[PDB]
Amino acid sequence: FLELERSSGKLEWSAILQKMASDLGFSKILFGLLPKDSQDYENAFIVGNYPAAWREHYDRAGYARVDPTVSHCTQSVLPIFWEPSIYQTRKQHEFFEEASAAGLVYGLTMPLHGARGELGALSLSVEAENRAEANRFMESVLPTLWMLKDYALQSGAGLAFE
Amino acid sequence: GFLELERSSGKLEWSAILQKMASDLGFSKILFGLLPKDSQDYENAFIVGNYPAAWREHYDRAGYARVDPTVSHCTQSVLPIFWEPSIYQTRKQHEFFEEASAAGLVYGLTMPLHGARGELGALSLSVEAENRAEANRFMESVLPTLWMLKDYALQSGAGLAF
Ligand SMILES: CS(=O)(=O)c1cccc(OCCCC(=O)N[C@@H]2C[C@H]3C[C@H]3C2=O)c1
Numbered sequence: 001f002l003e004l005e006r007s008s009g010k011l012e013w014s015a016i017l018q019k020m021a022s023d024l025g026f027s028k029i030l031f032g033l034l035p036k037d038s039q040d041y042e043n044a045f046i047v048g049n050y051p052a053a054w055r056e057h058y059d060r061a062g063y064a065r066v067d068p069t070v071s072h073c074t075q076s077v078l079p080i081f082w083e084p085s086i087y088q089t090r091k092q093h094e095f096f097e098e099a100s101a102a103g104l105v106y107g108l109t110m111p112l113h114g115a116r117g118e119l120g121a122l123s124l125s126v127e128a129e130n131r132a133e134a135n136r137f138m139e140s141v142l143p144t145l146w147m148l149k150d151y152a153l154q155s156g157a158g159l160a161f162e
Numbered sequence: 163g164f165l166e167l168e169r170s171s172g173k174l175e176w177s178a179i180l181q182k183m184a185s186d187l188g189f190s191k192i193l194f195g196l197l198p199k200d201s202q203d204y205e206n207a208f209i210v211g212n213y214p215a216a217w218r219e220h221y222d223r224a225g226y227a228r229v230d231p232t233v234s235h236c237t238q239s240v241l242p243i244f245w246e247p248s249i250y251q252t253r254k255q256h257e258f259f260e261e262a263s264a265a266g267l268v269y270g271l272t273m274p275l276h277g278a279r280g281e282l283g284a285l286s287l288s289v290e291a292e293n294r295a296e297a298n299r300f301m302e303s304v305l306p307t308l309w310m311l312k313d314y315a316l317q318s319g320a321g322l323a324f
């Protein structure tokens with residue numbers, strides 16, 4: 001947590017965070033941040049190792065308005081697990097199908113709501129045999145990740161805009 | 163007991179669930195405060211806790227919201243602030259600390275709250291300890307529990323405050 005905080009560059013900060021996430025057992029992750037009063041998701045500060053095809057697909061498809069975790073983040077400060085039950089609409093079912101093709105099935109999204117009104121998330125994806133395995137690997141790290149999502153948000157909001 | 167918080171039907175039962183939890187963790191006095199979007203008028207905020215009534219009342223007539231070093235910290239960070247002496251720097255802040263100690267609030271930490279609806283607040287927790295070192299170690303050993311709690315309190319507490 002110290003290294004993150006003390007990091008002076010976007011590039012080095014992302015590497016510190018990326019590795020931490022990896023050490024915890026997370027394959028692909030995404031740190032997204034928007035500033036105050038903004039909802040232009042596609043022109044947000046993005047960091048992570050999410051598949052490049054997945055992400056440009058997502059942007060062109062207008063998937064911010066379809067991803068069930070994006071609206072959750074506007075409504076809560078609590079984590080949302082990528083359970084099948086959140087994919088409810090016709091498109092959300094297609095979204096899930098396409099997300100799984102890109103290798104993102106299991107995981108959780110932790111909403112970010114910064115002191116200067118910034119809105120974002122730290123999503124983390126785990127590779128597990130089944131959902132019960134993924135919840136087990138996600139719960140064992142859950143208290144560490146909670147402290148991490150606010151350190152990431154406090155340091156990451158400095159570098160994103162300031 | 164985090165989930166019974168969520169499930170609390172009203173303000174009165176919710177406050178009691180929170181008071182007990184904080185107490186079980188080892189906290190003498192606590193305060194949960196929450197303001198709504200686009201507001202910075204601290205006298206008409208949603209307040210819960212067991213802070214001395216004379217202290218609370220003294221603090222408002224004195225306009226201590228603009229003097230409390232933890233109140234401005236909350237407007238700048240999502241990270242906890244410990245009630246170390248170095249926190250009080252101004253002349254008014256030195257008097258504030260002196261008066262806070264008289265009311266029995268000398269050791270403790272404040273956790274900022276920044277909700278999904280733009281709500282600004284905090285969960286401050288105080289410790290009756292013999293010295294700062296003893297205080298800092300107790301606070302450190304419960305810190306990961308509290309990190310989850312402060313968001314658990316903010317998510318449920320915002321849904322009843324307004
Ligand atoms: C733009 S921003 O950075 O300002 C911002 C603000 C608010 C929410 C936010 O999105 C968080 C959730 C995004 C996400 O992980 N999607 C993956 C992709 C697929 C596996 C399924 C997921 O849940 C982004």
Ligand SMILES: CS(=O)(=O)c1cccc(OCCCC(=O)N[C@@H]2C[C@H]3C[C@H]3C2=O)c1
Binds near residue numbers: 194196
């Ligand atoms: C009004 S609100 O509820 O909307 C709100 C919004 C932002 C900050 C906030 O204050 C958090 C810090 C208050 C506090 O614990 N003070 C004690 C009192 C004395 C021991 C020294 C302290 O630190 C309150």
